[PDB]
């Protein structure tokens, strides 16, 4: 009903009869996913996730929602043109929409909250709390793919995996290994993507393009305010240009579909910049205040062995419970 | 000066050629004085010789820019196509007028900060906690100790203290002067300082030729490293070096490695042979200063 | 062991002013990207720990002229 609100996604009604949206109350079906898969067929689509009552589950709803609008979207064209145009953009469309859903005003005006708490101190807790994971993953995906790229083009020759992994390692990200490793090890295969032929360079980009989406539609939106609860629902204008940019799907190059929506080919960071302004504004206040260096003045700096030597792992060291025990 | 000054030439081929000979003698002329003062800078005199280095770089440039904007505003719709190797070259060369594109202040900032650098450099020293009275410098006593002892301690105590004193003061020099040339290059064409240094040897594969060249060269400094590691190891203990691993940087002949030369002393296989060396030819036979030379000749 | 130890060296100190004029190097790792550089190319471990303060370029004399 949301998305019919603003004139988009007219659902078909094969959902509510041959959708499961539910977790399997019998047999060893799928535990849980993150995928929407399409019916395809030319005609019909479905839905395959879990269904639980945290905010968290209703946020992943609403973005496999959102991954459904595209498909509804595409279909008139050929079945090469499915694809929606830059890779990347399958998350980021289904992404900014949560971002309308998760704001505070959204849940209140559509009758989950109770009123509105229109409070600094909660503003910067909540952008905080998504700050944590929309920007320390930034470095992210960057870092992964710039590691695959030297490896496949040659530039990291089978005696420097992992030297060439733990410098980028250092470098973008900043976080050192603790144990002193050397080129026997393969630390790139613990994560998921990198065994798995998959890109991921994919998520920087929609990680960038979704802030910029959210921006160029807030202001088609009429609501010249901050960028936090600024939700596209009941936006008739916004539904009718977010419909017209979902209408192609890789027919144009994604430079072109983005000037078209935006105003501009080429991505930017500026929109990333103002949404998190307040945050960051509290960020550098904090770090002055605190007086500390930005980051990175020392490296080769490898944490010394904590007694990691396996009969020790299991002895407690938190506060709070030895607080308790005191008592 | 009456010859910084370019006449009106044409883009003809005959005034293209006045140009090239113009230019030819005016840069014969610049080039005999900066040599000259380069020349007294560093024979027996540098006071007030920087200084005249400084006013006749200087000069030069403002020659170079007059000049280059002439062939700029006298050549540019010409320059791509001349039909003739020679007067393409000499056009490009006159054309980079380099860091003569900043301003008044700027250019004077950016020799200033380049004779900084130099003197910071030639000036910096190194020595002991105590007794500093007097102590080393880089060439006459820096090289000769890193290159002929054999401690551990010294070694690393002449390095470290050199790298430190020769890089700590140097940081903020080196970041405008980065800023500065990549101004004046921008300015110049070029996309940056590295591309127009790339752009003398003409290539575009540039970078992938010289990684190529490096990966088949690599077995030999391989194995190289590996012996003079199992030297070094054989020699210092395993406590400062390992055999599955870097060596340290003081460790080899010369104090940033260059070469290794100096490490023959305990790296040289099969001693039994005599080492090849004249000296006892220069014992028999007196050579001061010109038999070296008479045998180039 | 004059000549091919010092190869490495020379395909890498224009190496590095390459990467600092391009601008991928700030300078906040100037010293990290040489001696990353070092340990990579030419295989030489520092002997002392070194922070980003330290300029290990300026030590040889074509770094400052
Ligand atoms: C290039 O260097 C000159 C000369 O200064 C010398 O090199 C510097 C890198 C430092 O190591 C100096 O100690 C060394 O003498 C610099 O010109 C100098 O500028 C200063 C600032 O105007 C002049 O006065 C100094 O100012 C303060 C106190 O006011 C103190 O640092 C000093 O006590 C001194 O009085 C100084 O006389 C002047 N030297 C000259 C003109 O010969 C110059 O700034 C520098 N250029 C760049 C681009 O960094
Ligand atoms: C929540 O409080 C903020 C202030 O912390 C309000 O800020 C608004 O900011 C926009 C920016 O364009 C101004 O145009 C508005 O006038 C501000 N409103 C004020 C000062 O009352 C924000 O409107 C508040 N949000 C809600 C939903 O009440
Ligand atoms: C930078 O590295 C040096 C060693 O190379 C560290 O040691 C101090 O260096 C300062 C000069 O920066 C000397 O005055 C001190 O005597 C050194 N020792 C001590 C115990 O302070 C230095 O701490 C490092 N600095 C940073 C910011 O990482
Ligand atoms: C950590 O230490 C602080 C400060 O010593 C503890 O706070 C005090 O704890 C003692 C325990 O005997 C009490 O008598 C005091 O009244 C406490 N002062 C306060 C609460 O201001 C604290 O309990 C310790 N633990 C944690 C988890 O912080
Ligand atoms: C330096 O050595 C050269 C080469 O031997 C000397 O030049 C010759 O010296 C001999 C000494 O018996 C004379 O007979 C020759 O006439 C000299 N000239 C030539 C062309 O052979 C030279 O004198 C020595 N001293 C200096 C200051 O150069
Ligand atoms: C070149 O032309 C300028 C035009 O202002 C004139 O002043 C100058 O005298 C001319 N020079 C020669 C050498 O003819
Ligand atoms: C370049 O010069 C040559 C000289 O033979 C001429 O044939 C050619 O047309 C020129 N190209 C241009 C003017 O673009």
């Known amino acids: ?327 | 000066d009456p010859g910084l000054q370019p006449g009106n030439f044409s883009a003809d081929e005959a005034g293209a050629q006045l140009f090239a000979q113009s230019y030819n003698s005016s840069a014969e002329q610049v080039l005999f004085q900066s040599v000259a003062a380069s020349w007294a800078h560093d024979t027996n005199i540098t006071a007030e010789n920087a200084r005249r280095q400084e006013e006749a770089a200087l000069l030069s440039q403002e020659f170079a820019e007059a000049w280059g904007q002439k062939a700029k505003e006298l050549y540019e719709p010409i320059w791509q196509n001349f039909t003739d190797p020679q007067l393409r070259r000499i056009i490009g060369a006159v054309r980079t007028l380099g860091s003569a594109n900043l301003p008044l202040a700027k250019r004077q900032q950016y020799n200033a900060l380049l004779s900084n650098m130099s003197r910071i450099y030639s000036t910096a020293k190194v020595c002991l906690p105590n007794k500093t009275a007097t102590c080393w410098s880089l060439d006459p006593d820096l090289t000769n100790i890193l290159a002929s002892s054999r401690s551990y301690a010294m070694l690393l105590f002449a390095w470290e203290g050199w790298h430190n004193a020769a890089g700590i003061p140097l940081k903020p020099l080196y970041e405008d002067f980065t800023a500065l040339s990549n101004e004046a290059y921008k300015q110049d064409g070029f996309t940056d300082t590295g591309a127009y240094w790339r752009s003398w040897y003409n290539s575009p594969t540039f970078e992938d030729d010289l990684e190529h060249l490096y990966q088949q060269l690599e077995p030999l400094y391989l194995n190289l490293h590996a012996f003079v590691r199992r030297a070094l190891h054989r020699r210092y203990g395993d406590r400062y070096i390992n055999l599955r691993g870097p060596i340290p940087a003081h460790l080899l002949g010369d104090m940033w490695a260059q070469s290794w030369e100096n490490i023959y002393d305990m790296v040289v296989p099969f001693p039994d042979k005599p080492n090849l060396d004249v000296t006892s030819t220069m014992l028999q036979q007196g050579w001061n200063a010109t038999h070296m030379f008479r045998v180039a000749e």
Request: net charge negative; with cysteine; proline share 7%.
């Open chain 1, 1 to 327: 009903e949301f998305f019919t609100s603003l004139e988009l996604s007219p659902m078909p009604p094969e959902f509510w009869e041959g959708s499961m949206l539910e977790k399997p109350a019998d047999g060893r079906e799928v535990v849980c996913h993150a995928s929407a898969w399409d019916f395809y067929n030319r005609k019909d689509f479905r839905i395959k996730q879990c269904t639980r009552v945290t905010m968290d589950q209703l946020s992943t709803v609403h973005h496999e929602m959102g991954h459904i609008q595209y498909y509804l979207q595409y279909k008139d064209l050929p079945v090469s043109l499915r694809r929606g145009a830059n890779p990347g953009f399958h998350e980021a469309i289904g992404d900014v929409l949560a971002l309308s859903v998760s704001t505070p005003e959204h849940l209140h005006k559509i009758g989950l909250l109770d009123r509105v708490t229109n409070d600094t101190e909660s503003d910067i807790n909540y952008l905080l709390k998504m700050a944590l994971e929309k920007i320390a993953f930034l470095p992210f995906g960057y870092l992964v793919d710039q590691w695959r790229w030297g490896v496949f083009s040659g530039r990291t020759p089978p005696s420097r995996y992992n030297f060439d992994w733990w410098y980028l390692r250092t470098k973008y990200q900043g976080i050192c290994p603790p144990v002193t490793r050397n080129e026997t090890h393969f630390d790139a295969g613990a994560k998921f993507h990198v065994p798995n032929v998959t890109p991921y360079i994919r998520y920087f980009v929609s990680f960038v393009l979704q802030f910029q989406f959210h921006e160029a539609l807030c202001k088609e939106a009429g609501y010249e305010g901050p960028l936090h609860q600024c939700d596209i629902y009941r936006s008739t204008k916004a539904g009718a240009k977010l419909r017209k940019v979902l209408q192609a799907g890789s027919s144009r190059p994604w430079q072109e579909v983005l000037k078209d929506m935006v105003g501009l080919d080429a991505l930017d960071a500026q929109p990333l910049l103002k949404y998190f302004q307040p945050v960051t504004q509290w960020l550098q206040e904090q770090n002055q205040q605190n007086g500390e260096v930005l980051g990175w003045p020392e490296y080769q700096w490898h944490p010394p062995l904590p007694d990691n030597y396996p009969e020790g792992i299991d002895l407690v060291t938190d506060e709070a419970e030895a607080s308790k025990f005191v008592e």
